[PDB]
């Protein structure tokens, strides 16, 4: 379903895993509802402190 791939790609962005990222989008996603500001904020929260 949608949310499984959504969370999988969320973790795939949090960690590097470029092959996992490329295969996830190669499956085909929406890219219209995956880019909400709260997802953007929680991705930004993964920045290293140091």
Query: Any known ligand binding at 28?
Result: yes
Query: Any known ligand binding at 1?
Result: yes
Provide the experimental method for this PDB entry: cryo-EM
C-alpha neighbours within 13 Å on the C-beta side of residue 10: 18
C-alpha neighbours within 13 Å on the C-beta side of residue 2: 5
Cβ partners under 8 Å of residue 21, min gap 6: 9, 12, 13
Structure tokens at 47: 């920045």
5 neighbors 24 (Cβ within 8 angstroms) = yes
6 neighbors 43 (Cβ within 8 angstroms) = no
- CB count, 10 Å around CB of 34? 14
In degrees, rounded to 5, the angle at the alpha carbon of residue 16 between the alpha carbons of residues 36 and 32 is 20
Residue 24's closest CA among 39, 44, 34?
A: 34
Cβ partners under 8 Å of residue 34, min gap 6: 6, 9
Cβ partners under 8 Å of residue 29, min gap 6: 5, 6, 9
């Amino acid at each position: 379903r949608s949310f499984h791939l959504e969370a999988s790609l969320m973790d795939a962005l949090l960690n590097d895993r470029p092959e996992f990222v490329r295969l996830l989008i190669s499956h085909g996603l929406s890219l219209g509802h995956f880019l909400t500001p709260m997802r953007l904020a929680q991705l930004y929260s993964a920045a290293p402190s140091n």
